[PDB]
Structures are given as C-alpha cells and as structure tokens.
Structure 1
Amino acid sequence: SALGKLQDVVNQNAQALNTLVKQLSSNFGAISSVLNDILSRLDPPEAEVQIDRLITGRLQSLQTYVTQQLIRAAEIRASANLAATKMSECVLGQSKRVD
C-alpha cells in the first residue's frame, strides 16, 4: 500500500465522525443525554435549563467538528493546489523545475 495519502483521508474523516458521535453521547452536565427523558420527567420551566445545557453541548461539539473540518480542508486544499499546479505545468506542458 503505497497509497497511504488517500487512505489517510478516509481514515481521518471516519475518525472525525467517530469523535463527533462520541461527543454526542455525553450528557453535558444534565440528568440525561437524551432529550425525551428531560421532556418526560420535567416540566418546561425547569426542563429549559437542561434543554439549553444539552443543546449547547451538542452545538459546541458540532463546532469543534467544524473546526477540524477547516483544518482538514486546508490540508486538502494545499494538496489540491499542488495537484492542479502539477497538472497545468507537467501534464499540459514541460517543467524546467527540478524535483
């Protein structure tokens, strides 16, 4: 397997999705990690705090996933710029640059 740069992309995407769904399993300092238990056991005036904590934790986990996606997209954009430059300079023409 000399194609260790393409399998790494799939592995990194899968590892980011795992990490996201593992953060989603946390209860973020609430009585339950599922919204249905909070709605079933608590009336809305005191359930709203639990709802806000759980939804805020989920949204912060999604935000961290988004920032990881910016890092991965920046690395992939650098690789794609290199690939496009090599396509335009070496596939479509001749390059005098060494290596």
Structure 2
Amino acid sequence: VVNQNAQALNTLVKQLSSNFGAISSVLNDILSRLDPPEAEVQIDRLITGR
C-alpha cells in the first residue's frame, strides 16, 4: 500500500513535465515567446491535459 501510494504520487508529480501537444512544457516560455491574444490555443490544451 505504501509503495503504490508513493508511486501514484510520483507519477502525478512527473506528469507535470509532459508537453500535451503544446510548444513546450514550461508555462512561462509559452506566455513570453508567443503573442498574448494568440497563446490561449496553446494554454488550453496543457490545462486540459493536467
């Protein structure tokens, strides 16, 4: 039970580094590199994946 809880938590933490079809996993890079009125199409997919 301890091991399965720990590995589930570790998988949940490590899932934050995925791309989910966006340009990058880093939120700051997406919001800085791209123009603000067109970055929503990149933010939304990452939000849905998380």
TM-score, structure 2 as length reference = 0.84
What percent identity do the matched residue pairs reach?
A: 100
Q: Deviations over 1:45-99 (max 9, x none)?
A: 2200111011111xxxxxxxxxxxxxxxxxxxxxxxxxxxxxxxxxxxxxxxxxx
Bigger relative CO (Cα 8 Å, ≥ 6 apart) = 2
TM-score, structure 1 as length reference = 0.46
Tell me how many residue pairs correspond in the alignment.
49
Segments of 4+ moved more than 4 angstroms: none
- What's the C-alpha RMSD, in Å, of the aligned pairs? 1.0
Describe the SS at the equivalent of 2:14.
helix
Higher radius of gyration, 1 or 2: 1
Q: 5+ residue gaps in structure 1?
A: 1-8, 58-99
